[PDB]
Write a protein that binds this ligand. Structure first.
Ligand code: HEM
Ligand code: HEM
Ligand code: HEM
Ligand code: HEM
Ligand SMILES: [Fe+2]
Ligand SMILES: [Fe+2]
Ligand SMILES: [Fe+2]
Ligand SMILES: [Fe+2]
Ligand SMILES: [Fe+2]
Ligand SMILES: [Fe+2]
Ligand SMILES: [Fe+2]
Ligand SMILES: [Fe+2]
Ligand SMILES: [Fe+2]
Ligand SMILES: [Fe+2]
Ligand SMILES: [Fe+2]
Ligand SMILES: [Fe+2]
Ligand SMILES: [Fe+2]
Ligand SMILES: [Fe+2]
Ligand SMILES: [Fe+2]
Ligand SMILES: [Fe+2]
Ligand SMILES: [Fe+2]
Ligand SMILES: [Fe+2]
Ligand SMILES: [Fe+2]
Ligand SMILES: [Fe+2]
Ligand SMILES: [Fe+2]
Lengths: 158, 158, 158, 158, 158, 158, 158
């Protein structure tokens, strides 16, 4: 079904956000894993998978709307050197993606692409979750201190 | 453990190949899926996952050797417009990756990084499999003709 | 038990046929497998195993009759370059083996080696089956055409 | 994938070794079985199957590398007349095959055919096992004497 | 159904062989059992049962063909005094029975009694097995020596 | 099978490394266990078992190659007095063993002892793992501080 | 708990005996295994494990008593060249260890270290078992002769 050009454009831009998140989250995960912070690797890895599911959704939708998914262009990854900096980088990235999602959702509604909109709201809800997780971790680091925070990631949570 | 700089370099270059394959294979998969060629989507999707496993291996190894995995730079994706062109593109990409693997493996051996080498040979064996699959599909297209080939992908293989 | 010399001779000659069939059928099988004609590989492989069972029977019988099984001499393999030629080669080979079996069976009967004869009739019945399979495939190729025939082998039969 | 001509050549030569072993081992097995040395038949039969698996590996690889597997030419079988002579013959044959494998493995490495090399090392490890088994049996014959050795093969080992 | 007189005659003669074998084998079995050669008792007992099955077959067939089964006349039993002599006696008896079976089978064929013939060939195949067993045991006695042979029968084979 | 003298020499030297590791790791394990650092005892004990498996491999291979395994000579154990010093000692020992393994692997390859080489690469991969574990623990001690590190070992990891 | 110095000394000396036994028994085991004497390898391997359990007991006890377990010093291994010599060597070693155990046990009692003593008596009981096994095997070799003895080890005992 021929979709609206600007919707497909937004979809590609959002897809673009997803696949920077996928890489940044995945590298972060395996950095944590290397440092033996087993728990941060499990969670951050899981978020990489979430982002993939998002990307898959955009791709299938763009294709359905008869546009060309663009996986060529990759945004700036901002990879940290320590736990805080890296969590803080994921948060800024989540926040930027959420801004773009808000914009796209409003636009989809006004050209009547309600199913694209419905898909994007589900995704936004997921993002809002990722944001909540990051914010809480970052505050915990400050509340309990870095050393205790680190000790608390050595063991995977059941 | 501090690894050899040129090994890490090769590892990053190989990682780079993996993540172009991941994207190209994934987009291809969902293109097939859209066209209703269910079987090509299953197989090509599976190869995307294989490539991810490869990437994960490089990342963990680079990190272990204390280098910086580079997920920033993305090579040229060559996406086709029809089944043949797209399979043919995956094949040229596999072949180029195999060339790089051969060089890296020989180099790892000469600096005594036998476990990197052992990892890369396992990967090369997987690639050689992907190559075999592509070659066979491409020949089948020619042997049975395009129409029959297409009909043969409509149904997922049990 | 000392057997009749000419029976043992026939048994060795028949054994000889078996082990050309074993090789030709096995190579054929893996040629098909390579070309992705999964179904022809399953069937032709199974016929290789049948031929092995036959060879085993001759060997044990020759040894029982106190002769020397001869696995040294190998007849001409005629390996094809395409499906038809290769099936057609297996058929001519089956037919020649059947001719030899008929001659041996009659001879066994006239020197009273009824159990060798009984073994050879069971084997001949198997051959007659292999012959039937080849004949049917070759006719199917002509009835439905080569392209359709080929498409029909891509998937293993449950 | 077009392989290196001399690798394919080595592969065919190695295949050639396999299929002499297959025959010699199989005939040996059924000779033992006839003599009621049940245990030597089980083991030697199993080694025949191993050799077949090896042959299958070469054939599929040669075909993959786009060469022609040669099952026409059969080397000299050296079949013994008694247990020792026959075991001793299998050992010399294993040793010759191991020499050829060493040479091929080194050559594969230098033309960068690492997956052929990897396959051949797995095979060589198997051969080294067959060699170990033969050596031990031959020494046991000498340590316990022939009569006791023979009595020890009457019953299949659980 | 009225059968051919000479077939019934052969059937009775063959029946006659069976029931000498039944007795000789059974006595042999229990002689071994007494001497504690548990394994020879199991095997030889089993052969007694086989012979009974044979006798049963003849009796039912003779009766079906409307002749009178003759269980009155019993041939010469040749019972040994030691393992070898006794095995050797069973072998000569098997060989004589096989000679008679060959004659009868040929005769049945020429008067068109194909089902009697078919029954007799099945039986002959069984005899040929009994013969193989005896021959192998007798050779084992010579290969490993009498003392080792005897020790090897003390324990029933699982 | 007569192996190459210098390979057997390397094998003995490597065996020698294994059995110092076995002792040092085992003593370390039970020191931790005494101090109530349950988790370090589980891990370090497991590494002792790994080293044993390694030693077993060398011994069987040396014997197979017809050399004499030397378990007489024992290197310097360097046992620590506190967690860090002891982990740090295991690390230096792992690193030295890895150096020797690299030397031996290269040598095996050049005398064509590919199966010894294949065994040693598997082992080296294991060592590389032990090294990774030590490095991570040592860094964790520094990141979270000694007190928190210690508290984190009181409980065995599920 | 601070233990008595001379008890710890005895404990280390006894530990010392254990770990020579561990090595000698293990090498012996794998020598038998190589020669195909499967049964002697199983038993002798099991005795190596027993000795390890003993060593573990000493180490934990020494540590508990606050002494330093000494795994540095290794006594003379006396490795045989044939089954008898090797069994005979294990026996002399067991006997010497038993002498040391008797002295230590008496000493523990007189300084009131009853739990060390209780541990050592359990161990002595195990040794006495190992001694019984060796003595019986050595006598069996003489009673049945070497050839029969050897044949009797070819098969693992269920
Ligand atoms: C380029 C860096 C990437 C890495 C290192 C990576 C890594 C991984 C790994 C290790 C898995 C686990 C395989 C499994 O068991 O399912 C996975 C799953 C998956 N990946 Fe990726 N991935 C990457 C990018 C992508 C991209 C670009 C896509 C497509 C938009 C994608 C789509 C998926 C999907 C759909 C799954 C299945 C999730 C599940 O069902 O568990 N990935 N990824
Ligand atoms: C020419 C003399 C040969 C004899 C007498 C022989 C005999 C046998 C027998 C009796 C079996 C058991 C069937 C089963 O249950 O799988 C077998 C299995 C097999 N044979 Fe052969 N064989 C011969 C040569 C070959 C050759 C030349 C090849 C191809 C290179 C081959 C390939 C195989 C394979 C792949 C199996 C399956 C093994 C398994 O999965 O158990 N054989 N052979
Ligand atoms: C004269 C000496 C014979 C002796 C000492 C003997 C002994 C035995 C014994 C102990 C059994 C085991 C019973 C059971 O559990 O089935 C048996 C079974 C049997 N007997 Fe006999 N037998 C003799 C002759 C015969 C004859 C002349 C026939 C008829 C032709 C015969 C027919 C059978 C049959 C059909 C079985 C059943 C086998 C089975 O199903 O296990 N026997 N015999
Ligand atoms: C140095 C030469 C040694 C060799 C070649 C060796 C070999 C082995 C092997 C192959 C195992 C089997 C692993 C398993 O499945 O449990 C084992 C087990 C074990 N080893 Fe050792 N070992 C040696 C020395 C030691 C020492 C010095 C100790 C400590 C005093 C020790 C303590 C143990 C323990 C406690 C087990 C577990 C037994 C079980 O639960 O099955 N070993 N050994
Ligand atoms: Fe989630
Ligand atoms: Fe997302
Ligand atoms: Fe997100
Ligand atoms: Fe795969
Ligand atoms: Fe890859
Ligand atoms: Fe690939
Ligand atoms: Fe069949
Ligand atoms: Fe056949
Ligand atoms: Fe056939
Ligand atoms: Fe095997
Ligand atoms: Fe082989
Ligand atoms: Fe072999
Ligand atoms: Fe039977
Ligand atoms: Fe009978
Ligand atoms: Fe009989
Ligand atoms: Fe481990
Ligand atoms: Fe090790
Ligand atoms: Fe290690
Ligand atoms: Fe025990
Ligand atoms: Fe002990
Ligand atoms: Fe002991």
């Amino acid at each position: 079904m021929k979709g609206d050009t600007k919707v497909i454009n937004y979809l590609n831009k959002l897809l673009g956000n997803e696949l920077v998140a996928i890489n940044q989250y995945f590298l972060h995960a395996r950095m944590f894993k290397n440092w033996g912070l087993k728990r941060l690797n499990d969670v951050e890895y899981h978020e990489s998978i979430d982002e993939m599911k998002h990307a898959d959704r955009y791709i299938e939708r763009i294709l359905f709307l008869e546009g060309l998914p663009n996986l060529q262009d990759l945004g700036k990854l901002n990879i940290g050197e320590d736990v805080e900096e890296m969590l803080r980088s994921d948060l800024a990235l989540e926040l930027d993606g959420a801004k773009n999602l808000r914009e796209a959702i409003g636009y989809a509604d006004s050209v009547h692409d309600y199913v694209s909109r419905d898909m994007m709201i589900e995704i936004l809800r997921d993002e809002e979750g990722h944001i909540d997780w990051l914010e809480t971790e970052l505050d915990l680091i400050q509340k309990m201190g870095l050393q205790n925070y680190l000790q608390a990631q050595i063991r995977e949570e059941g």
